[PDB]
């Protein structure tokens, strides 16, 4: 450390970290920015927070820290604390937790020709507005906006870093040697863009920032297995009410009302997961509400069928138009001996009246059966068509084929 201590004295015996490394005021300090993504920790939908683990490579030049390898016995590079050197105060503007700077203040590497390089890590919790229309088969655009906290475009300039071939790296870099795939989200694109705007006052100092846009796609196997398929099956169970008999002990309304109840349980389940925003309804939300309405209409229909089937003849006269509709729909799918004789005649008349009563009851039951038959096909067509139409929107929601390279 004799040479390293010599170099430290030679550099920092006279040095002011408060000041930009510029000979004149109207120079600009060009700073090469790169961002490496170690991990995409999470995307809290409820809080609308993308949590990511990143390394922030910032390179620039400081003429005050220039030196030669020969004069110091071979010291090619020197690690100093980051508080001893001037820094560009790069902050994540779109942070949600209030943390602007990096969490850990790593050392800065000072090289021979005054080149300064700083690669601190960071856990960043950025704001990401979640578009929910196609949840769980959705994709998101989460931006990370970096800017100097104090300096403007005429003092601190941003450029992207260049690879060995000289090509500009306009994207979030990913080191396979330091990347871990997220189990829920696949990154498809990650372009980067340097934006420059005019100042608040016309002709004043403008502003600049670097925005990295992560296009991320959800892997919906978990929600398909655990939320969608059970909901579809328990919803389809509502149609079985049509085959139960329309009489006491049939439990026709019990199945329908409890299926509705379970459908509301599933509503609460999706409510736990989706955000609370009101810009749009989630796809699972529309599917659930459609299926609840279908089940409610089937509860109504079961009530109507039970009403029609249990019309006794003594109170409800026979509707001829209903029977006509039924026939339409069928092809598509001695005084003491005198006392004894009067008694026997009364027996006969009573039994004939009872038989006619039973006949009219059977007719009403057949009407209920025919109505249930028709409405089963009606409800089945409605349920299947609505399920297909809702889920086809999820099927066609693919990530756009943007004019960018893959993010890998």
């Amino acid at each position: 450390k004799n040479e390293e201590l010599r170099l430290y004295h030679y550099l920092f015996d006279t040095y002011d970290p408060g000041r930009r490394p510029v000979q004149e005021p109207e120079d600009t300090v060009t700073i090469s920015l790169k961002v490496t993504l170690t991990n995409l920790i999470s995307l809290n939908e409820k809080e609308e927070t993308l949590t990511t683990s990143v390394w922030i490579g910032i390179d620039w030049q400081d003429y005050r820290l220039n030196y030669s390898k020969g004069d110091f016995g071979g010291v090619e590079t020197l690690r100093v604390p980051s508080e001893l050197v001037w820094l560009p105060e790069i902050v994540l503007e779109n942070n949600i937790d209030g943390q602007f700077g990096v969490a850990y203040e790593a050392n800065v590497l000072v090289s021979e020709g005054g080149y300064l390089s700083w690669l601190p890590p960071a856990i960043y919790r950025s704001t990401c507005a979640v578009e929910v229309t196609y949840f769980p088969f959705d994709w998101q655009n989460c931006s990370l906006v970096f800017r100097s906290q104090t300096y403007n475009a005429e003092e601190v300039e941003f450029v992207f870093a260049v690879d060995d071939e000289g090509k500009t790296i306009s994207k979030i870099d990913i080191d396979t040697e330091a990347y871990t795939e997220n189990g829920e989200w696949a990154i498809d694109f990650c372009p980067g863009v340097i934006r420059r705007h005019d100042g608040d006052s016309a002709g004043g100092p403008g502003e600049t920032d670097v925005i990295y846009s992560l296009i991320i796609r959800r892997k919906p196997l978990f929600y398909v297995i655990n939320i969608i398929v059970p909901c579809v099956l328990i919803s389809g169970l509502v149609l079985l009410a049509y085959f139960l008999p329309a009489q006491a002990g049939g439990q026709k309304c019990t199945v329908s009302i409890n299926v509705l109840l379970a459908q509301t349980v599933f509503l609460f389940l999706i409510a736990q997961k989706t955000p609370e925003t009101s810009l749009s309804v989630p796809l699972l939300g529309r599917y659930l509400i459609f299926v609840m309405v279908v089940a409610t209409l089937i509860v109504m229909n079961c009530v109507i069928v039970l009403n029609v089937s249990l019309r006794t003849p003594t109170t409800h006269a026979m509707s001829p138009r209903l029977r006509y509709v039924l026939l339409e729909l069928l092809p598509q799918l001695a005084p003491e001996i005198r006392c004894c004789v009067d008694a026997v005649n009364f027996v006969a008349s009573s039994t004939r009246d009872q038989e006619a009563t039973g006949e009219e009851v059977s007719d009403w039951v057949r009407m209920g059966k025919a109505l249930d038959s028709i409405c089963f096909w009606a409800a089945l067509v409605l349920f299947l068509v609505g399920s297909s139409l809702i889920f086809l929107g999820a099927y066609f929601n693919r990530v756009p084929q943007l004019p960018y390279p893959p993010c890998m």
Binding site: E89, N94, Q149, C253, L267, M292, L310, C339, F346
Partner: protein, 399 residues
């Protein structure tokens, strides 16, 4: 730069950040204060706290931080740590779960004329009273009172930068829409310091909730259950399923009232209209259960148990159908034993048929009551559903 280093050495040679930066102690420091709302992070209704991301721009002039640029290589501006200089002690009066004053000390832009601009960021968690009267179609006006804590108006004067807070860099919220925003200056006399007034600027924001989420997740299921309530009366008594439907609807409504109780603060200033609708639906279903118990009890009255009152036969058999449409309800010991047996058969069947007719009359009464109650209950459901919501709905649509 070397000139800038020399300048910074010169300015802070005998500088005192405790002293108010004016030429004379008898004059006040003029501070321009502006608020820039970057994001409305959260509106916690239960805790009644609004969390916002803001930039608190403060501009003033320091008398002792002026220089001639010609003497320092033409440097017309520098960036200085804010901890080294005097600052106004702006405090958020209505702080709830946050910091009273700024804690993140960014740098200050200092001009050669002494003009300091300082734009620190902050996460303000302020107390925001929740008017729950129209929830979820509710509008919340709440505010951020900001003022110098220890400096009265005679030593430090704060002025609003503009009437409205700056919403140019505002991230649009997915749950709230800011309709109005305004900053008002106030001269307040406090009991602690009667002699002198203290200045404050209250920045108020009026936010209208976007109710689609609560419409989809709460209102529509409740409407479906309230509609399902009325269908019990069209369900016959012979199916043995009126009670199951009624009690199932009531249990679902218990669940829903107990989840909406958790989405509202427990204050007693007012009762929400969604709560009013839930209790209307509660009493609605409970009355349905009581009256359906009466109907079911009426369905099984027989001559064995009860006789028909005259008024029941006057009303429900003849009066009501005026509106309805229905059916308006060598002798030997063994030989003589057989004859008397046939007599007994005749009398037994005649009496049984008469009692069956009486039971059918009672069933008819329960039937006509069921249709009357179906009409009344469906109309009451529609009337209540419109009455609770239509006021706020048409008020917002006309607004």
């Amino acid at each position: 730069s070397e000139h800038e280093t020399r300048l910074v050495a010169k300015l802070f040679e005998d500088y005192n950040s405790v002293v108010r930066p004016v030429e004379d102690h008898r004059q006040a420091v003029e501070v321009t204060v502006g608020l820039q709302l970057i994001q409305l992070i959260n509106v916690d209704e239960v805790n009644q706290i609004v969390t916002t991301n803001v930039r608190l721009k403060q501009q003033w002039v320091d008398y002792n931080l002026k220089w001639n640029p010609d003497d320092y290589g033409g440097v017309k501006k520098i960036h200085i740590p804010s901890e080294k200089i005097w600052r106004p002690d702006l405090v958020l009066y209505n702080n709830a779960d946050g910091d009273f004053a700024i804690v993140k000390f960014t740098k200050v832009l200092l001009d050669y004329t002494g003009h300091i601009t300082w734009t620190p960021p902050a996460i303000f968690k302020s107390y925001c009273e929740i008017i729950v009267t129209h929830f979820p179609f509710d509008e919340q006006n709440c505010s951020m009172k900001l003022g110098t804590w220890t400096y009265d108006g005679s030593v430090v004067v704060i002025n609003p930068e503009s009437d409205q807070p700056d919403l140019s860099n505002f991230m649009e919220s997915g749950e709230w829409v800011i309709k109005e925003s305004r900053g008002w200056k106030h001269w307040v006399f406090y009991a602690c310091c009667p002699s002198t007034p203290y200045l404050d600027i209250t920045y108020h924001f009026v936010m209208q909730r976007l109710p689609l989420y609560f419409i989809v997740n709460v209102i529509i299921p409740c409407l479906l259950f309230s509609f399902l309530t009325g269908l019990v009366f069209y369900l016959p008594t012979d199916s043995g399923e009126k009670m199951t439907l009624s009690i199932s609807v009531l249990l679902s409504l218990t669940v829903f009232l107990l989840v909406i109780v958790e989405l509202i603060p427990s204050t007693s200033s007012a009762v929400p209209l969604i709560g009013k609708y839930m209790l209307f639906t509660m009493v609605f279903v409970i009355a349905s259960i009581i009256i359906t118990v009466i109907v079911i009890n009426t369905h099984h009255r027989s001559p064995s148990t009860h006789v028909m009152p005259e008024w029941v036969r006057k009303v429900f058999i003849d009066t009501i159908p005026n509106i309805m449409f229905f059916s308006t309800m060598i002798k030997h010991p063994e030989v003589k034993s057989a004859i008397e047996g046939i007599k007994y058969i005749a009398e037994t069947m005649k009496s049984d048929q008469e009692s069956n007719n009486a039971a059918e009359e009672w069933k008819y009464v329960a039937m006509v009551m069921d249709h009357i109650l179906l009409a009344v209950f469906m109309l009451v459901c529609i009337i209540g559903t419109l009455a609770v919501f239509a006021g706020r709905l048409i008020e917002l649509n006309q607004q």
